[PDB]
UniProtKB/Swiss-Prot annotation, chains A, B:
It is an enzyme of class 1 (oxidoreductase). Coiled coil: none annotated. It comes from the Eukaryota. It is found in: Cytoplasm. There are 7 different ADH's isozymes in human: three belongs to class-I: alpha, beta, and gamma, one to class-II: pi, one to class-III: chi, one to class-IV: ADH7 and one to class-V: ADH6. Belongs to the zinc-containing alcohol dehydrogenase family. Class-III subfamily. Binds 2 Zn(2+) ions per subunit. Zn(2+) 2 binds at residues 96, 99, 102, 110. Catalyzes the oxidation of long-chain primary alcohols and the oxidation of S-(hydroxymethyl) glutathione. Also oxidizes long chain omega-hydroxy fatty acids, such as 20-HETE, producing both the intermediate aldehyde, 20-oxoarachidonate and the end product, a dicarboxylic acid, (5Z,8Z,11Z,14Z)-eicosatetraenedioate. Class-III ADH is remarkably ineffective in oxidizing ethanol. Required for clearance of cellular formaldehyde, a cytotoxic and carcinogenic metabolite that induces DNA damage. The modification N-acetylalanine is found at residue 1. This is Alcohol dehydrogenase class-3. The gene is ADH5. One of its GO terms (cellular component) is mitochondrion.
Amino acid sequence: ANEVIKCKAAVAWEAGKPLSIEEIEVAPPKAHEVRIKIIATAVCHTDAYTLSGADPEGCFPVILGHEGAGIVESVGEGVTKLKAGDTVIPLYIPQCGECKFCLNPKTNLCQKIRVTQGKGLMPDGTSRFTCKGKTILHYMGTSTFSEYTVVADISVAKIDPLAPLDKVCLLGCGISTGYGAAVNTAKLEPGSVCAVFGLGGVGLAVIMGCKVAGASRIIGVDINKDKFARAKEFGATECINPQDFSKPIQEVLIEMTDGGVDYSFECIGNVKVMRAALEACHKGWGVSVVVGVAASGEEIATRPFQLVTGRTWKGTAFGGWKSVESVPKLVSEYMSKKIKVDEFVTHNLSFDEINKAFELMHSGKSIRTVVKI
Amino acid sequence: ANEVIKCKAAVAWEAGKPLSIEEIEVAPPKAHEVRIKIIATAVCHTDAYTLSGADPEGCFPVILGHEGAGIVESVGEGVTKLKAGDTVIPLYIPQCGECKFCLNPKTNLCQKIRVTQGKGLMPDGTSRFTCKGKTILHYMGTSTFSEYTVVADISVAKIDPLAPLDKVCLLGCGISTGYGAAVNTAKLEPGSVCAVFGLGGVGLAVIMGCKVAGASRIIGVDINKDKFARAKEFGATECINPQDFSKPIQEVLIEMTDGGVDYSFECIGNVKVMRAALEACHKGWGVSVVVGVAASGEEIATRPFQLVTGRTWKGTAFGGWKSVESVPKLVSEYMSKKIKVDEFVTHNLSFDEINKAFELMHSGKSIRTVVKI
Ligand SMILES: [K+]
Ligand SMILES: [K+]
Ligand SMILES: [Zn+2]
Ligand SMILES: [Zn+2]
Ligand SMILES: [Zn+2]
Ligand SMILES: [Zn+2]
C-alpha cells in the first residue's frame, strides 16, 4: 500500500524570508488524489509575490511552486484515468468537467475545489504535508517545490511520455498564459497590429502567440532594453523603451500605428500600464487584455469615453485554457515545433539552489530558471 | 435654383436658458450637402445635457436636436443618390463608406467629418444657419430643431416612403442605440441573463433588444420605481430599486443570479453605476456594455481582478450601427413589427412648445416627446 514518503522540499516558513530545504513527510494520496514525483520546476513572478508577504491571501508555512512536471508515483482510490508512471503536469487551474464553469465553453475557471485550494488544503480540508511536527500548507493546488507533492485528481494533465520535463514544466503557467492570451482571449486575426507590455516570460509567450496567429506587427514595450533582443527573436517586429519618450506611452503607440494597435497585452501587473495598454488601442475596435496580476486593492481606471468609442477591456487566467484537455495539446504543439519552450529557459539550477532562482528573477536577469529536483 | 430659406427654428442662444423660437435663414445646400425639411423631432438626454451648459465642448448659440425624420427639400452639387422628395432620417454618426472605419466591420465610427461636426460646422468649415445677423452653429451634424436643416450628404439615411415620420424620428438615436447595444455590441445569445441600469428610452430599447435576442432573464435596475411598469411591458422579467437594499447593487444582482449576469448595460452615464454594472457580471464570461455618456473628466474604475477572472468591459455609440445602411433596415423592422417604436412615444407637442419636451425630460413616466414641426 502507499506509505508516507520522507523527502526534501523547499519550505517557506514565513513571508519575507528565503525558502528552506527541509526534510518533510508527504502523506499517501487519499480518495481522488494523486501523488506526483516532481522532476523539474521553475519560479513564476506569482510565487515571489506570495513569498514577499504582500499577498493578502498568502498563508505560511507553505510549499510554493506551480510550474512543474513529473511522474505519477501513486494514486488514491477512485482514480482510474491516471496510474503510477504516467508523465504529468500539475495544474493550478483544475478541470473537473462537471461544474457550471467547466461546462461553459467561454471559461476555464473550474470552481470545484477553489475554496480548499485557497486555504492550501486538499479537497477534504486537510494537508498532506508535515515538517518537524508542523502542518505545511499546499499552494495553488500544486506545491511543485518538493520532491513529491499530492494534488486533486482533477488538477492533473497527462502528457506525452517523451516530453522533456526539464522544459515542459514551463507550460505549467507562464508560457501557456501568454500564448493563450493571444490565441484564446484576444483571438487576434492574421495581419493584426499588437503591442506587448512587459517582456518577461509571459510577454514573450504573448509575442510567440501573436506570431503564430500571423500578426503583421508586434511592438514590445519595456523599460529594460536588455529584454529586447530575445523579444525580437520571439517575433517582435520592434521594441520601444517608454523612457526614451517624453509623452505618455499610449500616445507614442497611437502615433506609430496611426490611431493605435488592434490588440494590446499587459504582462506586468501594473495598473497604470494597464490603463496605458487600453488607451494605446485603436479607436473603434481596439482590444486590451490584462494578463498580469496586480497588487491587492490596486484599481485600473480610464474614461468611459475610451470604451464608448470602441475599445474593449479583457483579462485572462492561465491563457483561457481548459487545463486538463489543453495542457496535453500544448505539450504536443511543443513536440511538433509549433510553439517554443526551450527558448524560455535562461538558467538551470539544482534544488538546493532554488533561492537563486528567486534572486535571478528579482534582479531581472532571467526569463525562467529551471530547477532540477 | 436653391434659394436661402426663411423659417422657424428653436435657437439656444446660451446655456441654462429655454430655447427660443426664432425666425432664421437656412442657406442652400453647398457641394455634397442635403437640405432637409424636418417633419418630426424629439428630445434626447444629450440635447438637454448640452443645453444645461455642463458640457465642456458645448458651444452657443446652436440649433440642437438629433432625433428627427423628414423629407429632402434639395441637394447640393455632386449629390446623385438623394433627391427632393426622398424620405430620410438625419444621422449624427455618418457613413462615408470609404474611410478606415467604414471599411472595418467592427465599427461604425466614420471619421470623415468628425472634426468639423464637433465644431457645429459643415465639412467646409462654415454654418448654414443665421439669425438676427448672428451665425448659428450646427449640432451633432443634424440640428433637427428647425423646419429646415442642412447636413453632409453622408449624414443621411434614405428610408421607407411609407414610414410614419412622427414615429421613426426616434430611430435617430435613443431606440437604435439601446437596441444595437444588445444585438450588435453585446450580441447576447438566447437564454442570456441580463441587467439593464437606467430605464429611460435607451434602457427600454436595450430591454427590447434583449427580448428580441431571446434573453431568459432581464432585470431592470433604476432608483425611480415609476419606470418599472413600462420596463416590464418591454420585456423586463423584474425590476429592482437599488434604494430598497443596503448591499451595493452588484452584490444584490450577484445573489439573485447565483454569480452575476451574463450581460449588463449602463444607460445612465454614471461612472459609479458603470462600475457596479461591470461587477454585477458573472465570473468567467460576464460582459458589461457602457451605453451612457459620463460627464467630463470622470472615470470608471475597478480591480483588474474582475477582468482577469473573465469579465469584459465594452461600450457602444449609436448601438454600433453602420448608420446609412442600418437605419433603413431598422425602419423596416419597425414597419414589419419586429421592433417597437410607437411604445416609446409618451407625449406629443407642437414646435412652439418644444421647451415643455425638455421640462418633461427631467422626470417621469415620460420617455420620448415627439415634437410636430
Ligand atoms: K478577435
Ligand atoms: K456574445
Ligand atoms: Zn504563475
Ligand atoms: Zn469544474
Ligand atoms: Zn467613413
Ligand atoms: Zn441622443
